[PDB]
Amino acid sequence: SFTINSVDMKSLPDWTVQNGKQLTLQCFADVSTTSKPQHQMLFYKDDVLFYQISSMKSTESYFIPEVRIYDSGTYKCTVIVNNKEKTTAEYQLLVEGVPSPRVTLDKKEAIQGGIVRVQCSVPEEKAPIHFTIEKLELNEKMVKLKREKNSRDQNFVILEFPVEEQDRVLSFRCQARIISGIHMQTSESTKSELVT
Amino acid sequence: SFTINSVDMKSLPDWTVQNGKQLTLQCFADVSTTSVKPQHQMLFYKDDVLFYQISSMKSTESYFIPEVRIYDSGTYKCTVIVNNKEKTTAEYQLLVEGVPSPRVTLDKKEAIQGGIVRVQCSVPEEKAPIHFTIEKLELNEKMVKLKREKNSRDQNFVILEFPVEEQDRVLSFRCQARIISGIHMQTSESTKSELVTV
């Protein structure tokens, strides 16, 4: 006969992981037998099934090449043998850090009084993302203007910016934030362009 | 100077699809411009949640689902960006039809009187929520000896224990699964045979 002794869920490299790395989720099962069993394993994230495998081996794995904060959450894995169950404790996977964001400008040469639509997207992540956008000024070395913006439905923003008669050479720099249980920030990003 | 004329979102073969088949979602954009081929950024959403992101130079981009499942069914919209101008498709309602035949599993191949038989019925290609029906059937009798209904909010399978009567010695169980969408879908049967001793 059989015995589901106990069940684990290891996380390689850890239950906390730097954004961008690869991550592996394991489901271990200790099984006692009197001469060899097939397992069925179900991986849940937040009690929603996302992977299913039936194998002869006691450790089963799930590979994430590129961890993202959207992957962060509550993980449990259930193992069935000969229609007997047992369920791992809950495991909280924590993803840290935000990739540098992508800034984009409709113009690279702009006129005075006019406008310049500036996009800032974190393409490798999903909403909700908070942005901070500084309008920087080169011939003066001073931040003219800052915009905070919260992006509920999207992972990007397009802001209109006015060309004040005040200068001719300027760039915009951006920085994004996302949550994992506490809060995560990026490095900056910029692109240059000029005014008449 | 660019102008996004319009954007659509076609579905191959259709916005209604049989469970199990391959499906292609396209995001098209009509672009008029006075210039220089433009760069596109397209965002595929499901239920107003993003699932695919791609930047291309051609106007049509695709997303392939090799085996559609009802869990993939939902509201699909796609918004495309060119030169930091937006436009978002209408919403599209994709509908998936049919449930795969379920998979029945028995802890015993031989059971003794009065004892139990744990019966699993799983639909592994689909996710919760699933309604199951498990009948204990009889070869020498062909009448339903016993039925168990069960709804599974959390799981894509059920394990019901069944009693072995003394009335019989060889019996099989048959199962059929249901999932609802506002419209509900049924499966075919599944069975596996096994017997009893004194």
UniProtKB/Swiss-Prot annotation, chain B:
GO terms for biological process: angiogenesis; bicellular tight junction assembly; cell recognition; cell surface receptor signaling pathway; cell-cell adhesion; cell-cell adhesion via plasma-membrane adhesion molecules; cellular response to mechanical stimulus; detection of mechanical stimulus. It is found in: Cell membrane. The Ig-like C2-type domains 2 and 3 contribute to formation of the complex with BDKRB2 and in regulation of its activity. Expressed on platelets and leukocytes and is primarily concentrated at the borders between endothelial cells. Expressed in human umbilical vein endothelial cells (HUVECs) (at protein level). Expressed on neutrophils (at protein level). Isoform Long predominates in all tissues examined. Isoform Delta12 is detected only in trachea. Isoform Delta14-15 is only detected in lung. Isoform Delta14 is detected in all tissues examined with the strongest expression in heart. It comes from Homo sapiens (Human). GO terms for molecular function: protein homodimerization activity; transmembrane signaling receptor activity. Keywords: Cell adhesion, Cell junction, Cell membrane, Disulfide bond, Glycoprotein, Immunoglobulin domain, Lipoprotein, Membrane, Palmitate, Phagocytosis, Phosphoprotein, Repeat, Signal, Transmembrane, Transmembrane helix. This is Platelet endothelial cell adhesion molecule. The keyword Transmembrane helix applies. Changing residue 58 to A: Lacks homophilic binding ability and is distributed over the entire plasma membrane. One of its GO terms (cellular component) is nucleolus. Glycans are attached at residues 22, 53, 120. Disulfide bonds join 27-78, 121-175. The keyword Disulfide bond applies. Residues 5-90, 114-198 form the Ig-like C2-type domain. Phosphorylated on Ser and Tyr residues after cellular activation by src kinases. Phosphorylated on tyrosine residues by FER and FES in response to FCER1 activation. In endothelial cells Fyn mediates mechanical-force (stretch or pull) induced tyrosine phosphorylation. Cell adhesion molecule which is required for leukocyte transendothelial migration (TEM) under most inflammatory conditions. Trans-homophilic interaction may play a role in endothelial cell-cell adhesion via cell junctions. Heterophilic interaction with CD177 plays a role in transendothelial migration of neutrophils. Its main location: membrane. It comes from the Eukaryota. Trans-homodimer (via Ig-like C2-type 1 and Ig-like C2-type 2 domains); trans-homodimerization is required for cell-cell interaction. Forms a complex with BDKRB2 and GNAQ. Interacts with BDKRB2 and GNAQ. Interacts with FER. Interacts (via Ig-like C2-type domain 6) with CD177; the interaction is Ca(2+)-dependent; the interaction is direct.
